From a paper:
Bruton’s tyrosine kinase (BTK), is a non-receptor tyrosine kinase that is one of the five TEC family kinases expressed primarily in hematopoietic cells. BTK propagates signaling from the B-cell receptor, including B cells at very early stages of differentiation, as well as the Fc receptor, Toll-like receptors and chemokine receptors. In addition to its causative role in XLA, BTK is an essential signaling molecule for proliferation of leukemia and lymphoma cells in B cell malignancies. To facilitate crystal packing, we expressed the kinase domain of murine BTK (residues 396–659) with a kinase-inactive mutation, K430R, and substituted six residues in the activation loop with the corresponding residues from ITK (hereafter referred to as BTK KD), which we have previously shown stabilizes the activation loop in solution and has been employed in prior crystallization efforts.
Comparison of the BTK KD/acalabrutinib complex structure with the tirabrutinib bound BK KD shows large differences in the conformation of the activation loop. This is accompanied by extensive contacts between the side chain of Phe413 on the glycine rich loop and the activation loop that are not present in the acalabrutinib complex structure or any of the other inhibitor bound structures. To test the degree to which this unusual activation loop conformation might be related to tirabrutinib binding, we solved the structure of BTK KD/tirabrutinib complex structure via co-crystallization of BTK and tirabrutinib. The x-ray data was collected from the crystals in the PEG 8000 condition and the BTK KD/tirabrutinib complex structure was determined to 2.6Å. Tirabrutinib binding is identical in the two structures but the activation loop adopts very different conformations in the two structures. The activation loop conformation in our co-crystallized BTK KD/tirabrutinib complex is nearly identical to structures of the BTK kinase domain bound to ibrutinib, zanubrutinib and acalabrutinib. The RMSD for the activation loop residues 539–567 in our BTK KD/tirabrutinib structure the BTK KD complex with ibrutinib is 0.43 Å, with zanubrutinib is 0.58 Å, and with acalabrutinib is 0.46 Å. Thus, we interpret differences in the tirabrutinib complex we report here and that solved previously to suggest that the drug bound kinase domain undergoes dynamic fluctuations. Indeed, the activation loop conformation in the previous BTK KD/tirabrutinib structure is characterized by elevated B-factors compared to the rest of the structure and some side chain densities are not visible. Acalabrutinib and tirabrutinib both contain the butynamide ‘warhead’ instead of the acrylamide group found in ibrutinib, zanubrutinib and orelabrutinib.
Residue numbers in the entry: 395 to 659
Write the structure that this text describes.
């Protein structure tokens, strides 16, 4: 879906991310959108444009919807669903004093549903983390930037030894061999659940990249958050099996989450 940039009205700046400065505006006068401006030189644009066609066809209620791109000028624009409440980590860190444990479980369910959709399309996120989940005006958490790191040039972000890499959300098979799969997303999902139930602490907030890799190499894990019940910790902990093939699928993870919701009501 190519959008005509003459149909965009820019209203407010939402700040600047890694891929680009992003603004809030309206599309054809009526529809809320976010508009990302993609910095020249930051992404393999021709490869991204081919992949943008696939992301355009990803559609799930718990996935931030990509509405289209503007590619007949430079910089290219990404037009997406507007998420009034911003980053999940900021959201957790804003009203953490207000959340009920029932609310934290629903957020986990939101992300799991999005990932189950992605898993059903054999589409890897590649960088699942709270830093790319957003929250709408109804408090719904949505997954964002899915599959965006494959097109990033910067050498440190892509490299697994870079100072940009998400070591602390990376599974062993990624850190050792750059072996991405659904099971690497599962690992990250477990870490994300830790972030949600930890009200947005950085995992291993005191550790370097190297020390974290050594920790995971020794088979050690993040601890149970005080706010996490026994059952919920078991689900998230299951995502961190040393053997990728022993980790659950998002469908199985989801059913487990629904089972605890039925159990905790
Ligand atoms: C916090 C999780 C991220 C962050 O750095 N923010 C500063 C600006 C603000 N924000 C956005 O960055 N986005 C957003 C993210 C991703 C896209 O493109 C997209 C979505 C899905 C797949 C690929 C690309 C566009 C814009 C915001 C959005 N949509 N709404 C509201 N605030 C956003 C948070």
């Amino acid at each position: 879906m190519e959008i005509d940039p003459k149909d965009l009205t820019f209203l407010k700046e939402l700040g600047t991310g890694q891929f680009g400065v992003v603004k809030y505006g309206k599309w054809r006068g009526q529809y809320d959108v976010a508009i990302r401006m993609i910095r020249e030189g930051s992404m393999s644009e021709d490869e991204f444009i081919e992949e943008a066609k696939v992301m355009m066809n990803l559609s799930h209620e718990k996935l931030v919807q990509l509405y289209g791109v503007c590619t007949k000028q430079r910089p290219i624009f990404i037009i997406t669903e507007y998420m009034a409440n911003g980053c999940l980590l900021n959201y957790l860190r804003e009203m953490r004093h207000r959340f009920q444990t029932q609310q934290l479980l629903e957020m986990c369910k939101d992300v799991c549903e999005a990932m189950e959709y992605l898993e059903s399309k054999q589409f890897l996120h590649r960088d699942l983390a709270a830093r790319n989940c957003l929250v709408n005006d109804q408090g719904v958490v949505k997954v964002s930037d899915f599959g965006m790191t494959r097109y990033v040039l910067d050498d440190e972000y892509t490299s697994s030894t870079g100072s940009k890499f998400p070591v602390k959300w990376a599974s062993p098979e990624v850190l050792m061999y750059s072996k991405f799969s659904s099971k690497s997303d599962i690992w990250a999902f477990g870490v994300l659940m830790w972030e949600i139930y930890s009200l947005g602490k950085m995992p291993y907030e005191r550790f370097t990249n190297s020390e974290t890799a050594e920790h995971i190499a020794q088979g050690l894990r993040l601890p149970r958050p005080h706010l996490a019940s026994e059952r919920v910790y078991t689900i998230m902990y299951s995502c961190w099996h040393e053997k990728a093939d022993e980790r659950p699928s998002f469908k199985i993870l989801l059913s487990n989450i629904l089972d605890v919701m039925d159990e905790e009501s």
